[PDB]
Design a protein around this ligand. Structure first.
Ligand code: PRO
Length: 56
C-alpha cells in the first residue's frame, strides 16, 4: 500500500512488465526482488526496474 515515484519513463518490454511515465505515483505491490518491483500504474499492474522508482 505504500507509494513510489517514477524517476524515469519506462516502456514495458515483456508480458509481466508495465509501462510508467516519469512523475507517476505508483502503488508498490511487491518489493521482495532487488531488481524488479511489482507496482500498480493507474489500473494496470506489473514489474518495473526497482532502480527507476523511489519510495515515498
Ligand atoms: O520476464 C522477464 O523475463 C523479464 C526479466 C524480468 C522482468 N522481465
Amino acid at each position: 500500500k505504500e507509494l513510489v515515484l517514477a524517476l524515469y519513463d519506462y516502456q514495458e518490454k515483456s508480458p509481466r512488465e508495465v509501462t510508467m511515465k516519469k512523475g507517476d505515483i505508483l502503488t508498490l505491490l511487491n518489493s521482495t526482488n532487488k531488481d524488479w518491483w511489482k507496482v500498480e500504474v493507474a489500473d494496470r499492474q506489473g514489474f518495473v526496474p526497482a532502480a527507476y522508482v523511489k519510495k515515498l
